Amino acid sequence: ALTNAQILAVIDSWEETVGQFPVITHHVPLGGGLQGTLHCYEIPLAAPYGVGFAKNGPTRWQYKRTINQVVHRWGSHTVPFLLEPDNINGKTCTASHLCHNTRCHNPLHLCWESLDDNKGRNWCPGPNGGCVHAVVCLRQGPLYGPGATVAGPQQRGSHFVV
Amino acid sequence: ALTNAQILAVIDSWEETVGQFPVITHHVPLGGGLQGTLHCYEIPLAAPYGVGFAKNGPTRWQYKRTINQVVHRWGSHTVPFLLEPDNINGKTCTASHLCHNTRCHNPLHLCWESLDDNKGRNWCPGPNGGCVHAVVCLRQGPLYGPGATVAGPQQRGSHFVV
DNA sequence: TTGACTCTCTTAA
DNA sequence: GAGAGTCA
DNA sequence: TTGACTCTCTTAA
DNA sequence: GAGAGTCA
Ligand SMILES: [Mg+2]
Ligand SMILES: [Mg+2]
Ligand SMILES: [Zn+2]
Ligand SMILES: [Zn+2]
Ligand SMILES: [Zn+2]
Ligand SMILES: [Zn+2]
Structure with missing residues (x-):
């Protein structure tokens, strides 16, 4: 809600609840032929999810608290960043998973950045x-690699140059 | 419906029309601190665009030809790839700009690949x-770089480990 | 047969 | 990657 | 107040 | 990144 104290209370209650989510170990590519280990705190697959949490889409959740007798609600991954600017260079800030695991709510796996920065991590070669x-990836992006391009640049005639 | 010869004729008429688009020289980052040059064949900003071309969205165009009294229409960048498979790994193939310049219709600046592969080129460090x-980029992706992340991973308490 | 508009849709963050 | 409404 | 659902929306390829 | 309709 409005005051700094109330926002801190929201963040603290969120962390305490998410801190009780099952901790799931994921071994991940780091780039450079190296492998690392992440510990994701994964929201349950089905209700009940935890105090304050509800599922609004297949892989979307919201956190809800009643403050000053009013319901306040946030995207479930946005809560760690409630004291941060909500835009950057005129672009909306988004919760961005460094572990690329949407069920994870570990704030040590989240950052707050434009949707473009967020998306781009999918192809990052990784921390090794x-x-x-600048805010380093925790793993190589799941889509990093040579791709599967079906056809490359080509012309039939002689009208074009690169 | 359309024979291989008729498709080749469509590609040839498309190339002949696009080849007359204004050719714009762009200096571009290649990665590795190097600069290169791309020559984009840019569809006009407003009608008329060229024989067979019409704008269906702010940065979307279509190519239309009528053959044996039947109207055929294609996305304006898909025409070079009409003799190619249209899906791969269960994913639809998309026209993908290696020059990241949507108005460009130079077929030497296009490839044919999944939407994920297409998007990922935005963040590629580039050919140098x-x-x-595997089908190499022509330039460093426009969104390559350290990003502008507003807040990184963080917790207030001690409930989490990375 | 053609041009110049109109509309909505797909994907995965 | 989001916001908000309907029920119990 | 809290939970468990429902719906549609944003962005830029 | 797409497909399709209307009108003259
Ligand atoms: Mg992400
Ligand atoms: Mg592209
Ligand atoms: Zn995680
Ligand atoms: Zn990275
Ligand atoms: Zn080009
Ligand atoms: Zn590349």
Whole structure:
């Protein structure tokens, strides 16, 4: 809600609840042929999810608290960042999973960045393969690699140059 | 419906029309601190665009030809790839700009690949900065770089480990 | 047969 | 990646 | 007050 | 990144 104290109370109650979610170990590519280990705190697959949590989409949840007799509600991964600017360079800030695991609510696996920065981590070579993200990736992006391009650049005639 | 010869004729008429688009020289980052040059064949900003071309969205166009009294229409960048498979790994193939310039219709700046592969080129370090795309990028992706993350991973208490 | 508009849709963050 | 409404 | 559902929306390829 | 309709 409005005051700084109330926002801190929201963050603390969220952390305490998420801190009781099952801790699931995931071994992940780091880039550079190296592997690491992440510990994701995973929201349950089905209700009940935890105090204050409800599922609004297949992989979307919201956190809800009653403050000053009014219901306040946030996207479930946005709560750690409630004291941060909600935009950057005129772009909305989004919760962004460094572990690329939407059920995870570990705030040590989340950052707060534009949707473009968020998306781009999907292709990052990873912290041991050349990640240049200022807020460093925890793993190589799941979509990193050569791709599966069906056809490359080509012309039939002689009208074009690169 | 349309024979291989008729499809080749469509591709040829498309190339002949696009080849007359204004050719714009762009200096571009290649990665590795190097600069290169791309020559984009840019569809006009407003009608008329060229024989067979019409705008269906702010940065969307279609190519239309009528053959044996039947109207055929294609996305304007898909025409070079009409003799190629249209899906791969269960994913639809998309026209993908290697120059990241949607108005460009130079077929030497296009490839044909999944939407994920397409998107990922936005963050590629480029052909001189570590591109691993099997069909190599022509330039560093426009969104490559350290990003502008507002807040990184953090917790207030001690409930979490990474 | 053609141009210049109109509309809505897909994907996965 | 989001916000908000309907019920119990 | 809290839980468990429902719906549609944003972005930029 | 897409497909399709209307009108003259
Ligand atoms: Mg993400
Ligand atoms: Mg693209
Ligand atoms: Zn995680
Ligand atoms: Zn990274
Ligand atoms: Zn181009
Ligand atoms: Zn590349």
